[PDB]
């Protein structure tokens, strides 16, 4: 155990809540996406282009295997990680599982906001529908693995993260 | 000196090329955005919401100051970092400056591709125009600071990163 796993779709607040927890605890925060890019030595866009989604899922499972071995870490889990039974196995076995929820509107804010640009980017309605369809069919699975569940709309990082830390223990 | 600074707009390949360089050199790759979120203990979306762009630029400059002190690192620099004279000062003084270029089409690929989703997200034409306007007015500034310049379309990470390492020295 000892690991904290944060799960949910893109824009669920994994990075946000994940950053606050790592502050309050001096633990190292990992992001499975960034870890994959690091080991690959290329960005996610290169992976999908040269190897397709399948190529990414492969690399994703290798990294999850490796990360789950580490102890006392915190992990912002790529939304697609729980699609694989093996990943769900290692995760449920090696740490607590927190499912973070957010409205479609909260999602689009986080996803769209870039540092170099004042207003967030907006996605096409086509893409938005795709996202809401994902929300639809991945939610139940997330709920399954969820030891604990929290909304992250109107988020007060510090408040929620300490609250989360209390709900851990037990 | 000793630092490698990667600059450009979102989707310029900073993370990609940055990951390949860190592999080939066993150096630590930093991303000013992630560093900011880490110290803040919240995501960029929270910063812009509770403090606006101004609040972000403040935090951005503190982190750039701190990172520039570090030695022999690699840094994927947030697109907005070079807007501040002080940042441009510390950067040009403490390392090499690589400007990475990419077509609008290459940009939209990298920006839109999420790990958990097969096809990339597409942004609205409104947002795309905003991006091309940024490209327009930030390019010259990037070119100014650029010690070295590379395109990243049809990127062969390994090939370009070694090529970059050769062009360093001198």
From Swiss-Prot, chains A, B:
ATP binds at residues 11-16, 119. The keyword Kinase applies. Mg(2+) binds at residue 15. Its EC number is 2.7.1.71. GO terms for molecular function: ATP binding; magnesium ion binding; shikimate kinase activity. Keywords: Amino-acid biosynthesis, Aromatic amino acid biosynthesis, ATP-binding, Cytoplasm, Kinase, Magnesium, Metal-binding, Nucleotide-binding, Transferase. It is an enzyme of class 2 (transferase). Pathway: Metabolic intermediate biosynthesis; chorismate biosynthesis; chorismate from D-erythrose 4-phosphate and phosphoenolpyruvate: step 5/7. Substrate binds at residues 33, 57, 79, 138. The keyword ATP-binding applies. Its cofactor is Mg(2+). Monomer. This is Shikimate kinase. The lineage of its organism: Bacteria, Pseudomonadati, Pseudomonadota, Gammaproteobacteria, Legionellales. The gene is aroK.
């Amino acid at each position: 155990l000892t690991n904290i796993y944060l799960i949910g779709l893109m824009g669920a607040g994994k990075t946000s809540v994940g950053s606050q927890l790592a502050k309050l605890t001096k633990r190292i925060l990992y992001d499975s996406d960034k870890e994959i890019e690091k080991r690959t030595g290329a960005d996610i866009a290169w992976i999908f282009e040269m190897e397709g989604e399948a190529g990414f899922r492969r690399r994703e499972r290798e990294m999850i295997e490796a990360l789950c071995k580490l102890d006392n870490i915190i992990l912002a889990t790529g939304g697609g990680v729980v699609l694989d039974e093996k990943n769900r196995q290692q995760i449920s076995e090696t740490g607590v599982v927190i499912y973070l929820t957010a409205s479609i509107d909260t999602q689009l804010k986080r996803i769209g906001q870039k540092g170099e640009m004042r207003r967030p980017l907006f996605i096409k309605n086509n893409s938005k529908e795709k996202l809401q369809q994902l929300n639809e069919i991945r939610k139940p699975l997330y709920q399954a693995m969820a030891d604990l569940v929290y909304p992250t709309d109107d988020l007060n990082p510090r408040q929620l993260a300490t609250q989360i830390l209390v709900d851990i223990k037990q």
